[PDB]
């Protein structure tokens with residue numbers, strides 16, 4: 202009836218904690234998940250590194266991102282790595298996550314703040330020149346503003362992370378979409394969203 | 405295709421406007437002005453001499469710009485005209501770009517994120533759009549342990565200062581903790597003092613201490629652990 206099997210769990214990917222539990226300390230942008238996290242301190246710290254050892258994927262491939270843009274990408278990582286409220290969207294590839302609905306604000310602000318930064322492809326899931334150990338832009342792929350390769354917020358949310366996320370038309374506090382970041386003061390707005398979807402009442 | 409970072413300097417852009425409006429009428433056929441300037445603007449909007457991150461610091465920008473403007477004035481003061489002028493100019497721009505490439509490469513190897521541990525915040529200028537913002541240089545979670553032995557009855561100095569803290573932006577306060585064996589802590593000082601002095605030490609002052617340099621951001625910029633031994 203309610204999908205409690207699917208609540209308060211962590212996906213089986215190589216970095217993730219097997220089970221969620223509180224942490225004394227998490228680095229910067231992953232602080233909102235202190236209460237109950239699927240990331241260790243080390244994971245949280247690693248999320249903020251240039252060419253994070255978590256993925257060996259370079260964001261600076263078209264040069265260094267504006268800090269505001271970088272912040273969004275890091276938060277995405279914090280969320281992916283730390284959230285105990287993704288059960289309903291977990292699927293096998295040894296697991297991943299598919300079409301987690303990010304609230305419209307999250308995708309819009311992310312898009313907004315990355316407009317000035319630069320990239321070379323619109324589908325980051327593959328098709329990279331991988332020769333150095335880390336991805337670089339393939340021959341003939343021009344570095345241009347994000348708004349060129351990601352004309353909409355939806356493009357950005359969905360294609361950078363290989364359909365791990367879906368751009369929901371629902372707005373924050375609807376009860377029907379998740380925030381990739383939230384102020385620790387405010388309490389976690391995604392717990393109830395997870396519950397709802399776990400239930401037989403929503404798919 | 406990326407700009408020659410030197411246009412981020414206002415004095416440079418104004419010097420280029422002054423060249424167009426003040427110098428070209430007296431030193432070049434009117435027919436040639438528009439093409440000349442399109443040509444100049446192309447030389448400046450593309451910088452081929454450069455792993456280039458697209459950023460620069462104010463010092464590096466200034467050095468390049470100063471050099472450039474100095475040489476540019478050399479040309480205008482010489483009062484040179486026509487072919488002579490055109491060819492000297494572009495030849496100059498070429499050589500300037502090579503010189504500036506050096507300043508950049510030096511900046512990347514020596515001044516970009518010089519911290520060897522922790523997190524330094526430093527202001528950079530993005531060449532692609534002349535936007536100037538603060539970048540985080542993250543090197544390591546820790547800055548490592550210090551093992552310290554103190555003669556009994558002498559003063560213990562714990563130094564939390566690093567080479568780069570003076571340079572970093574967005575720093576607040578050095579907090580010092582005692583770390584007890586029972587998994588708890590106590591804050592003992594918190595201020596602009598980069599050191600902690602405990603005078604005339606006794607055996608009870610041995611053990612673990614931690615320093616945290618605070619940041620305007622949500623996490624600390626430097627963490628150093630001291631392990632203190634007292635010689636009885």
Ligand SMILES: *[C@@H]1O[C@H](CO)[C@@H](O)[C@H](O)[C@H]1NC(C)=O
Nearest residue numbers: 215216253254255256257334
């Ligand atoms: C990323 O690259 C490093 C360094 O070459 C490699 O040893 C490591 O296996 C990779 N890390 C992960 C988590 O896959």
Ligand SMILES: *[C@@H]1O[C@H](CO)[C@@H](O)[C@H](O)[C@H]1NC(C)=O
Nearest residue numbers: 583584585586587588589590
């Ligand atoms: C824990 O440790 C210290 C030193 O071992 C002791 O003095 C203190 O009473 C303990 N603190 C608390 C709050 O229990």
Ligand SMILES: [Cl-]
Nearest residue numbers: 284285286391
């Ligand atoms: Cl969450």
